């Protein structure tokens, strides 16, 4: 009996957790005894639609996640073959975007810097395996407990070729542009330093407790104007070229803001690293 083999006839769909253009993540109960005692699991799968291989990309995502082992990376549990489904552990607290607005009273700056460290450890582990994540945002950081977070989605994750510094992207219409570094917006090139820029944005979200009126989209649309349609991304590039950045969050000390700003150097080569950030946060926690 293979414990990573989930039979479709026992995987009971409960509700949607997430939806993109091509696929979804759903809450299921795996219930082989038929009495609702089985474990809740998160299930990634494709919409019937498909195309230019969404299936090949999901199969690659499965092999990426199956072979990652880090306490700050969501746990692979198995697959279901029917078309294929990725089975992951279910974290009932959800993403930082769900959890932080409801728990501001109990999550103080120390706890925020601890989450920051754990996000940097999972990212540094992914970088060491020659992966770029390309979608690091608070909506993809899951809460295991009050004391532990995990990166919880790998839908855009790509291998950087051995002896290369970046991955060039082709399918980009659904890019999360308010988290993206200039090189990503201007040339669809994705470096590890591009994930460092996305981390700085995610840190700003963590420091604003993911409030919707302080989101990176809301704040950048206030700076550049919300009415620009197809011109939005070139206006965003121009704002960043001029050196404008997301402002210091309320109650964020300058010493934390300065680590964030090192994430947002225009040139990738000038940005801090994940291991520098961990050292910086650890000095502040000492
Ligand atoms: N991380 C994280 C956030 C998500 N999440 C996982 C769990 C869990 N494991 O528990 C969870 N938990 C809760 O919300 C509990 C409070 C109730 N939320 C929810 C949002 N989706 C967005 C999304 C959807 C589809 C694709 C996708 C599909 C097919 C092919 C390619 C791409 C994709 O890459 C990403 C990502 C996972």
Swiss-Prot record:
Tissues expressing the protein: Expressed at higher levels in primary colon tumors than in normal colon tissue. The expression level in metastatic colon tumors is comparable to the expression level in normal colon tissue.
Domain (Protein kinase): residue spans on this chain: 11-285
Residues noted as binding ATP in the record, renumbered to the chain: 17-25, 44
Source organism, top-level taxon: Eukaryota
Subcellular localization: Endomembrane system
Catalytic site: 135 (proton acceptor)
Post-translational modification: Autophosphorylated. Phosphorylated by TYK2 on tyrosine residues in response to type-I interferon signaling, leading to its activation. Phosphorylated on tyrosine residues in response to interferon gamma signaling. Dephosphorylation of Tyr-166 and Tyr-167 by PTPN2 negatively regulates cytokine-mediated signaling.
Phosphotyrosine modifications at: 166-167
Associated disorder: Autoinflammation, immune dysregulation, and eosinophilia: An autosomal dominant disorder characterized by immune dysregulation, severe atopic dermatitis, and chronic gastrointestinal inflammation. Additional features include asthma, food or environmental allergies, as well as poor overall growth with short stature.
Function: Tyrosine kinase of the non-receptor type, involved in the IFN-alpha/beta/gamma signal pathway. Kinase partner for the interleukin (IL)-2 receptor as well as interleukin (IL)-10 receptor. Kinase partner for the type I interferon receptor IFNAR2. In response to interferon-binding to IFNAR1-IFNAR2 heterodimer, phosphorylates and activates its binding partner IFNAR2, creating docking sites for STAT proteins. Directly phosphorylates STAT proteins but also activates STAT signaling through the transactivation of other JAK kinases associated with signaling receptors.
Subunit-structure text: Interacts with IL31RA. Interacts with IFNGR1. Interacts with JAKMIP1. Interacts with SHB. Interacts (via N-terminus) with IL2RB and IL10RA (via its cytoplasmic domain). Interacts with FER.
Swiss-Prot/TrEMBL domain comment: The protein kinase 1 domain is also called the pseudokinase domain and has a regulatory role through the transactivation of other JAK kinases associated with signaling receptors. The protein kinase 2 domain is the catalytically active domain.
Family: Belongs to the protein kinase superfamily. Tyr protein kinase family. JAK subfamily.
Designated name of the protein: Tyrosine-protein kinase JAK1
Organism field: Homo sapiens
Lineage, uppermost ranks: Eukaryota, Metazoa, Chordata, Craniata, Vertebrata
């Amino acid at each position: 009996v293979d414990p990573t083999h989930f039979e479709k006839r026992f995987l009971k769909r409960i509700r949607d957790l997430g939806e993109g253009h091509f696929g979804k993540v759903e809450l299921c109960r795996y219930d082989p005894e038929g009495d609702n005692t089985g474990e809740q699991v998160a299930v990634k799968s494709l919409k019937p639609e498909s195309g230019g291989n969404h299936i090949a990309d999901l199969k690659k995502e499965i092999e990426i996640l199956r072979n990652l082992y880090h306490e700050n990376i969501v746990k692979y549990k198995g697959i279901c073959t029917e078309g294929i489904k990725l089975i992951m552990e279910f974290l009932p607290s959800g993403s930082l975007k769900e959890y932080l607005p409801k728990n501001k009273n109990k999550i103080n700056l120390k706890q925020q810097l601890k989450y920051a460290v754990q996000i940097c450890k999972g990212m540094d582990y992914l970088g060491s395996r020659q992966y770029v994540h390309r979608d690091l945002a608070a909506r993809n950081v899951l809460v295991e407990s009050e004391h532990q977070v995990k990166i919880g989605d790998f839908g855009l994750t790509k291998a950087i070729e051995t002896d290369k510094e970046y991955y060039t992207v082709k399918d980009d219409r659904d890019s999360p542009v308010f988290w993206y570094a200039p090189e990503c917006l201007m040339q669809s090139k994705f470096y590890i330093a591009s994930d460092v820029w996305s981390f700085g944005v995610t840190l700003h979200e963590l420091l604003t407790y993911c409030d919707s009126d302080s989101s990176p989209m809301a704040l950048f649309l206030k700076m550049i104007g919300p009415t620009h349609g197809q011109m939005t991304v070139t206006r965003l590039v121009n704002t960043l070229k001029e050196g404008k950045r997301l402002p210091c969050p309320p109650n964020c000390p300058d010493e934390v803001y300065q680590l964030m700003r090192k994430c947002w150097e225009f040139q990738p080569s000038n940005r801090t690293s994940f291991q520098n950030l961990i050292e910086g946060f650890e000095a502040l926690l000492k």
